[model samples]
Each structure stands twice: as structure tokens, then as C-alpha cells.
Target: ESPGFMVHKKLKSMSQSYGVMMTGVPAEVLGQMQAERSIPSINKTGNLKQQIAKEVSKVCHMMTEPTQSCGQASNDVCELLLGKIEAEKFHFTKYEALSADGDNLKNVLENTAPSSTNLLIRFEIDREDPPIVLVKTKNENFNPETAVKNKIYLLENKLYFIDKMGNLFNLGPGKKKCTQLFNAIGDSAEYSLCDPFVLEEPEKPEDFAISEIVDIFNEQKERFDFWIGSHSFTIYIPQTLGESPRQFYPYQAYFGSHTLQDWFVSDKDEYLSRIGIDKYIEKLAVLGKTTNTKERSDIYAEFFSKRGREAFFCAHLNEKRQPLRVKFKITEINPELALKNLQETQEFIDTHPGENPSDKVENYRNRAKLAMTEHLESLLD
Candidate 1:
């Protein structure tokens, strides 16, 4: 205490504000004096430090409680008064709940929605008692009984609390239901916070079967540039197979880095394959040949019927991946039909003031393939 006083006295000399004016002690000399005393040292029949303590409380109330800046001028003075008494021994700590809207304090405490929370608390630590306990809320359905003691104190207007098991909490009003996620890897575009590959919409709480979830990931892969026919990808399998077999739902397909559409979409074969029909290309390869539609249909039927959905999905991917493989049928069809189709296709490409001439070819190719696939499935008969 003497050492602390000497430091304060020196601080006072440097600032020319030697003592706490409110404590009735001289600003210069009172820095070392013992003014505030504990409850037990007073008379057994009555309170000894009641008057000075009341004044301290009043100061803290005015400076700390309302705006809730616990470290303000008056509060600082009050802390010195508390220091004089050694507040850690106190039995009862005083805390005030604050609210944005006065009436919704109950809802703010009970609801899972995020609400306002800026409050002030002054611990009467001068008397012997358990440390103060505060409830730090993150979830709405919290039980008040679980409130625990933490390392927190009021500074000025700003209240700092630990988020991961923090020391203090604000008791503010109002709430907003929130569901959002954000991620910007290294220094790149911010992508979805929620992993699109996982199946949140589940069949059951224990229903971890994510084969269908894999389909969702499949679709997303087609949209995103994360898939490259499994050449540069990974699949995560959850260690525990209680219900779901797939680990990460999306299996979090990754295609190295910077595999954005522009990087490879300009490649002629890869670009066209992604947006063009395979059968049409084959049909055009061998013109004026009598390859019957029945034969073509039979071979396709055999291929699809023998394959599982997984293989079928792979087929979609394989068809899009490039390396212009040329093949011929046992019999060929007339060049008249396929040749005319090719001419019309070229004509459409050359004539239309197609969108985004910069990357328009790739874009058009993607769309055309999509259009062809959508309609071509019907023509499979």
C-alpha cells in the first residue's frame, strides 16, 4: 500500500494533481493515506465506513452505471475507494441489467436471437463473499442457473467481453435471428461460409447417408470449377460412419488454386466439349454412312443400363473433359443431315452478336451444351 501510494504521489506531482479531491484528503498528501476501511473493522453495533462508502457508490452510480462506462472519472475515484476497502472480500456485488428497449429484457435473455448487450456492474468486493458470476450469452435457450464467474470489468463506454468463454457479458435489449457464413481464403473472393457439399436437409437426425448429398455436390461441381474429372480432387470420408458415409458432404472438391473459368475455358477442345453434344460430334465425323439410329440407341442403352448412377454421373463429367477423341460407328449415316447441322451451328456462331465477345465463345459453348443435353436426352429414343 505504501509503495502504491508513493507511485501515485509521484504521478500526482508529475500531473500537478497530487490527490483525489473528492476524498477530503489533500491532493498532494492523501495519496498515501488509508481513508476507506472494511466493514468488520467498524463498530460491532453499527457500520463505520457507511458515509464515505455511500459517497463512493453515488460517484460510481453517476459515472459508471447509466451510460455504463465503468472506468470513468467518478468510477475511477470509486475504485480507489473500493481499493481502500479491498473489494475482493465483499459478499454482495451489485449489477444492473441494461436494455435497448426497457420492456424486452426477458425476451432478450431467453431468445436464441442475437440481442443488444451493454451493461454495467459494480462489485461490492469489500466484504467477504463468493466472486461475482455473470451470464455471457451466445445461444438463446440458455438457463440462467449456469451463469458463471469470469474476468471482466467496466472500462469507459466500451464493454469488452470474451467470445470464447469470455470474462463479461452485456445485458442489452432486442435480437435478430442470424444464419450466415463467410470465408476469404488467403486473399481471394469470399466464398460460401456454409459448405455447399454438406446435406443439412437430412432424412433424420441420425440419417447421415449423404449419397444424395453427393448428388448436390455433383451439381455444384458442374457449376463451380472444383472438378476436373477427379484428376485434381479429393473426397473426405467422415471417420465415424454412424449414419452418413460421406464425411464432408461436398467432399469439399478442390482443383488446386486459380482454376477459375477464365483460366481454362479458352481452350478450344475443353471449352467446346463442356457445352456441345458428344453424339452430334460423332455423327458429323463420319458423313454419308448408314449407321442406323436403332444400332446407336442399342449401344447407348447397353452402356447406360450396365452403369450405376455413380458411373452415369461420371459419364456427364467425362463427356465434358477434353482431348478430342474421334470415333466411328460400324455403319455411317448420310452426311446430308449431320453436315447441314454442322453448317447451321457454324452459321449461328458466326452471325449472332453473341454475348461477351471476350469470353463469349466459351459462354456460348457452355450454354449450347446445356441446351443440347437437355433436349438430347429426349432424342435418345
Candidate 2:
């Protein structure tokens, strides 16, 4: 095994450093590919390597797990370590039962929230396993921008995990719990990341000299998308039905171990129409506003609903993306509302640590609060 992602030592100098590092058989595999040869030998005993051999995993297309700055990932891990949690046992269905007082938890229900900005990005990540990681670093000065520059890792997937505190761990590795969907694009001011459109500029992923690999990359590009909208901008390449990678799901009934809130909050359909989406396609056919024959292109163009423009939206997350759209609603928003929510979130973070196993929801409450404020102001503008 060489020190790269593939066996093609020739291209090693090119892709391995494309931002993320690859080692072991992964490196050699690429090297062999460049050499116009096959792997000399395959080992079943190599657990991680063996795992990579499966094409279904789609590991080859990934540079590495997308993660937040090391500072964020590390902090997330610290709490996990403190809780004595191990990654092997990490399950998407279970949320840790942490409390502000180290007991159960005191949770407060929060309305579905959108990004403070009207923009939303979408990407694909593994469910049971995600590409985003929360890597912790001793470098307190570590900036997330630098992390994106280096592309060492991505953040934890929004669908599967949350951190120890009530805050949502949208980016980073090792964070578990608080899987969420974003209704609108994220605010660039806060969740800044590399530009998906420009990041691969001149050198596109398809340009890689691997045989069918180029086709794979080409397909991937078409599979992902990011955009700016009238009320908000969005990114995430989705398809109609069959053979589409862009799938959205905010289906509640989270499989994770419940904190206290899990017991109540049963009106799933109501949640879908108001702050929820994913299921909107079913009702779209009956809207009567469309000619019904409009091409998917034209109909899909109706990205924002006037009513939704005024309300907070919750967008979904995909790991293989980095999108930054407009801020708040299609209209100008009131920052005061955001400021209030931020304060509430901070207060919740400060006080809810000892609450209960199921009642911690400061993060969602505040985030929704901010989104509401941003939408109001954005609409005004």
C-alpha cells in the first residue's frame, strides 16, 4: 500500500492531495488504476480496506469525510468521550440521554426552523455512516475556512447526530443525535464553506484519468446542485422519482433513543404541511396552480411558495455539498428576532445541561426563532 488514495502513484501527486488524504490500499488502488493495472492482491483481513472495496459504499468518489473545523469536531468528541461512548456502538437510531444537571433532561418543543438565510444547500451523506466528521484539535485558533481549504474532513451529517449540549451539530465527525432538515439555504455568515460551483473549477472531478471513473464523477456532478432563489437560494441536485440521488426525508419518529420529548409530539402530518417539506411532492400535483403539463424544469422553477416565503423553512442536508444561499426570507427580516433567539439558545445551553433525559431543545427553539426573524427582515428587503 502506498501513501495515497489509489494505487496509481503517477496520479498520486495529483488527487491524493486534492485536499483530503488517503492511505493504505485506498492509495494503492488509485496508483494501480493510473498504472493501467489491477490490484496485485486483495486482502479480506483488512477491515477498513475491505470496507472500501464495496462499490455500493461509493467510497471512491469521496475525498474524505466532510467535517467541521477540528475545534468543533474535537469539542463534540470530548463530550462523547466524557460520556464514554464508542464509535462502534454509535447508532443513528439512538440519541444520548444527556441532561444539564446530569440527570434526565427538560425539553421544550420548538417549531420547525429554517436557516437564518433564505438559502438552502443539499448534499448526500451516508445515513448509518456519514462523510462529515467533527474532528477536535488543540488549535483553538483553527478557523473553519482553513479546514475547508485543507478539506481534511466534513461535519457530522444532520440526519444522524447531535452533540452533548442541546445545540445541533450540523458539521463535524463523531457528533451523534439531533439529525435535522434545513428548510432553506444556510446563512453564509455562519455556516460558511467552500463554494461547490467553483471549488472544482478548471480541474473537474470527471477529468481524473481513471477509466470509467470520469463518467462516475460526471454523474456525481449532475447529481449535486446549489442555487440562489428569489426568496432564497438552494443547492442539491434532485431527480423526479426513479434512479435519483437527491432524496429528502424529515420523517419524524426519529429512531434514536428518545429524550423526554419522544413520548409526545404525535401530529406528524401537521408538522409536514407547516414547517415540514419532504412530503410536499405528493400534494404538489393537486395545487391547481400549474397547467399540469408544465415540464419538471418549469414547474420545479417554482422553488419558493409565497406563504412559505413568509414562514421559516426547513431544508434537508446532503453530505456531498456546500451551498450558501440568500439570508432570511425572500423579504427583508428583523434581526432583533434572531438576536432574541440567539440569547434564548445561549440561555438554554447554559441552563438545560442538568434538566432531563428527554427535554433539551434550546438549540431548535432558538434556531427557529432566528429563522423567523431573518425571514421577516429578508422579506422587507
Candidate 3:
């Protein structure tokens, strides 16, 4: 059950019959009534809030039993106030014997004819408890092309109607019937009206974190780029799935690719088929001037097979003729993984001594970690 449902039940179970003052009445109506001295007890010099309170007090005094059984008294006070104010534009009524499945309400609305006057329908679910459902039709400001607008509010067995300005008007109790009827049947009611309130369990922290991360990635273009050396590469981070993140690689790069344009145009499968993996290994051997065996080619092929489309591989020639290798792919980004990538990239650069150092790789790793941390913090804020 929702907190709202529990609160409604608690209020209903109390023995006291509460008097609810009418509020959210339009300013124009209050002003006109005040100026004409319709309700002589109203405080002429008071602010809008004070004037409204006084008006409610005076209207409640006119009632024989301003305080009745629980929500009933509230209904009486609201009806009396509306009558005193002469707000003919707003119409209110309640359905006493609605079907449990809401078919009765549906049928009645279907049969009703259209009119210019606004109509409001207030009713309770299961004929006893709330959250109360309020449905409204065409009026001066609201004119939907095909359907009426509706809202749900949790009340202590009381009916409420909120205007466009978010003013709450207690139309009385949910079961109180009136002679008024709907002036317009704008469109067929939504099926959601049948079961407007559904129980939703709170999301687990892990689940919430993943959704937050996904939303951040979606807003920030789903990829992050950083420079490792003279060569730069991008990590195509995958959007998180249920428990594990799904792989998403939109572009690929070959051993010789340099610019982003080259990465975009390169296709791994096409390149492999054109100049087989054997020749590709030979090319790698010549670039690095080292022995590249079939075993290395097989490993590269397997890794590239799963993530090649999102991977960018490049080799740069330094003054000492040493090859500086860099590769990027679609994978998960986290503090741990960022540190690991930095270590691995640094180790490679350390062994292949050249002008290329580990400074850029370390900087990229710190930046990536900081970015993810900041994003998570922002979600909390």
C-alpha cells in the first residue's frame, strides 16, 4: 500500500468530525464577493489568505451542522461556500454506486452529451477508501481536442478538485451525490482510470545507481575521449543493462589508423578479409620491427571480434623508431578499471622507451575517475 492510502485510512478512523475550510477559490470571485459585501463578515482590509479564511468561517456559520461525521462535514462546508460565492462555472458531484471494475462510470460518461459548461466527477475506489480520483471536462481555459484531463489526490474520504493554477477545492465527500451532471463527454476515458493507484516498491540502491549512470551517459553522448600520448583514443562505454552492461561499439580502428576520420571509415572484418590476419600480423611485425607470431594474431582477432567495432588501435613512430601502441574499446568505466588501464598503458610505454611517457595516460585515468565520481554525486544532489 502507498503512504497516501495509509494516511487516508488513519484520518478516517479518527472519531472527530473535522471542519474543512474552502480554499483555492479564484481571486476574482473572492474580490467581487468582498466588494459587493455579499458576505458581510469578511475582513475588508485583510490579505487574500485572511479574507479567504474569514469567508470560509462566515459560510460555515450559515450551515446548520458545519461539523458532521468525519468527511461529511467537510463536504457540507465546501458546498455551502461554493453556493455563497456563486461560482457557477465550477460544477461538482459524486457517484454513490459505482461498479468495482469502473464499467458503470464508463457507460454513464459514454452516454452523456457534450456541452460548453465544465464538469467534474469525484469518486472513491471500492466505494469506501481513497485515493480519490477527480475527472474534469472542457471549460473556459481547458479545451482538449479529444479527451478530458484527470488527477488523483489522497484525501480522508473527501473529494478535491485542483485548477490549472494548483488551487485545491474540497468538493465535499466522495459519496455525496448532486443534481449536477457532466455537460460534455469529450472522449473515451483512459483504461488507467479503472486502476489508477498501483503499489510500487522502492528501487534498490544498486538498481538506482545503474539507472542514474545510464541517464548520465545518455545525456553526455555515451562516449568519452582522452589522449594517451601523441596518439589519442576514445572509449565507447556501453549502456548498463539489467545486472551487466551491454556492449556498444559504433566505430573501429586498424593498426595504422591515425585520425578520428580514419577510425570511422575503418572496418575490422573488411580489413581482415582483404589482407588476412597472417598479413596483418606481418604488418604489425614490420611496424614494431619485432617478431609477431600467430598466437598474438589469434588473441587480437578474438578481442577484436567481440569489441573491434568500438575499438581504436593506433601505432606511432618515434625518433628512436620505437612503436607507441594505443587501443580503445567499448567497456565499463570505473575507478578500478581506470587504474588498471593506466597501469597497463604505462607498463607498455615504459618497456618501449621513446619520447612517449605515462604522464598523459595517468592524467586521462584521473580525469575519467573524477568525471564518474562527480556524476554520481550530482545524482544525489
Candidate 4:
């Protein structure tokens, strides 16, 4: 009569393997039978059979997933039955103090916060690989670091911890055995109890600039221009150096006005050679004429539009003319949406041929620079 009934009929045919009689049983009667047998009961709401099928399918799907191990899958199902709020108390919380300084383990364990009962302690002993230990204690003052001798006793369908002085403590009635937890921790992929929570060193923007620009240039060499400056001196950036067109644009603009200034008179030839231009005529033959502003702007816009804020961060330079090392902090705008906006800007520029669209394009450029400044300010906060 319904999809639920159809699923029930299919499941009923395979119920012999499950050791449960499914045929010719009313839904209400089946619910009562499961309840009396201490089995987990399905929600007794609208379309009960559908909910049953849905819950069973979820269990089957989780078991089939490659990432979840057998013990973890079983534990997850048990947690679902126990309800999340009740299960939260048993969840493992990492004790970083014990993990970081094992020499002061005694002091750290004695002073640990008493609010949490379950603690995951990692010990890195001298000349030995670190071991992860899960401790469940009823006593708030329990410190395993000071215990001279310890024994794990399996009694009454539960694990009990017996200290050196014969004090007994109960480990919770959780699905994971002490040995199973140890083995899972040893195997990195199987350990899903708690995150390691280790933060990696932030990547330098200089490294990002080289890698991204080099990758883009390698993909299509024709898309980029390597020339910088106007009439004074030509700078031809070597493709081997891995510098992009956008990286040198700001430098070109800076030197365009200052090359004739009295302050920069002594460093004129030195600066040109430092950027890898040996002879002006040699570069003029290779690079032909100066790259036009419209073509340069289009290429610059395309790079940011594709790579977004990270590429934008890498485009700027420090006083030393190196890629600025800074953290990118913009969270709301991602690359895909930025690409869409840039494409829209390009569309506006293309359509409005008669009108002065330089203002609109300049506005986008200014906003992008403002975003970088905002990102810098976020780190100071």
C-alpha cells in the first residue's frame, strides 16, 4: 500500500538471518515485543515502518562506509541508542598537560580540572614512541602518574582499575576495551576517539606566490606577460625565476615615477640589474614593446578572479621587493564567488564601451587592496 510496506516486505524475507520473526506481525504488537525484550524501540510516530527501514538502512550504510572501522561503527550505534546528551559525559577529552611535559606528569595530573571524568592522556617516555591511554575515574583526585604499580582487572562484565595500594576503581561500561583502545591509538587511521588538535605552521605568502604563479604559467605560458616598466629601462623577468605578471606591476608603477628622481639616481642601474635585466637593448628585442595597461589589467584581474584572496595576498611586495609574508583573514568571500564577481565586472566593462568604465575597474582594484589591509588588521586583533 505504501513504500514503507514495500521495504518491510523485503526486510521480512531476510529476517531469518537476523533471528527475528517479521511476517504476519502488526506494527504496534512488534513495538511492544521489542520493548519487553530490552531491544531499542523505533519512534512510534507517523509511518512507523518507514522510520524502522530508515534507521536500519543508516546502520547498514555506516557499516559499508570505508572510513569507519568496526569498533567505531558499533560504538556509534550504541551512542545513538543511548542518546547524545547522556553519551557526552563518556566522550574523551585530551589532557595536553600530561602529553606535553611527561617529566611533570605527577604535578599536572594532580592539578587537572575535576569537572571531566574521562581523560585521554598521551605519554612520550624517553627513547620510546608515545602511547595513548584512556582513563576513567570516579575519584577526582586520582593520579595514575604517582601509582607505583597498576593492574587492569576484568570482573563482573566491566574493567576495574586496581592501584598499587589495593584501591579499586571502575572503568565505565563503554564498548571499547582497554586493549582495543590501545590498539586503535597505535593505528593512526583507526583512532577516532578525539582529534590530535595539533596546528601546523602557517604557510608563508612568498612560498604561495611562487607555487601558484609557477603552476599557472606552466599550465599556459601564452596567458602571461613577463615585461615591466615603460621607456627608461626594460626588465625581462626570467620564466625560471617563477615570477608572474601581477607580481611586478606594482614595482613598475613605483619605478615609473621615481627613476628620474634625484634620490634614486645612484641606485638606478643597480636596481635594474638586481631584477635580472643585464642590457636594456637585449630585453627590448625579447619582450618587444611595453605591455599595455588594458592587457596587463585584464591578466591581473583574471588571476585574482580565479585564485581569490590568497592570490591577492601574494601579489603585494615588501620594501625589499619580496612577496609579503602575511596571513589571509577574509572568511566570507571564497574564490568561486569572487570569480563570478570579477566576470560580472568584465561584462560591465565590455558592454559599456562608449562610457568611462576605468572608474568602475579602479574601484574593484581599490576594494581588493582594502580587503588585504582588513586581513592584516584581523591578525593584530
Q: Judged by lDDT, which candidate is best?
A: 3
TM-score of each: 0.14, 0.16, 0.14, 0.14
lDDT score of model 4?
0.28
For residues 1-381, could you state the per-residue lDDT of candidate 4 as single tens digits?
222222222222222121111122232343333323322344454555454445444433332232222223223322322234433543443312222222243343335332221122211111111112223322343444553234433322334444444455554544354334333222222111122332122154433322332233235533322222111111111111123221111011112112111112233323334443223222322222224433333333322121232234224351112111111000111223323433443444344223443443344333433443333233223
Please give the ranking of all candidate structures by lDDT, highest first, separated by commas. Answer: 3, 4, 1, 2
Q: Compose the digit string of candidate 3's lDDT tens values, residues 1-381.
A: 322222222222211111111122233343344334433444446564455445544433332232223123222222222232322322232224433333444454335332211112321211011112334332443423332222322222333333333444444434322112122112333112223122123154433322332233234432222111222112121223234322212222222222222222343323443453234334333322323433333433332322342222212221212222322111112323323433443343344323433443333333433443333233323
For candidate 2, write residues 236-338 as lDDT tens digits: 1112233322322211111121111121123222233353233343223322122333332232223321222212222223111222211110111233332
- Give Cα distance to truth, residue 12, candidate 4, Å: 38
Q: The CA-based lDDT of model 3 is what? A: 0.30
Model 1 lDDT tens row, 253-281: 11221121211222221222333233322
TM accuracy, model 1: 0.14
- Considering summed lDDT, which 10 consecutive residues are worst modelled in model 2? 251-260
Q: lDDT scores for all predictions? A: 0.26, 0.25, 0.30, 0.28
Compute the lDDT for candidate 2.
0.25
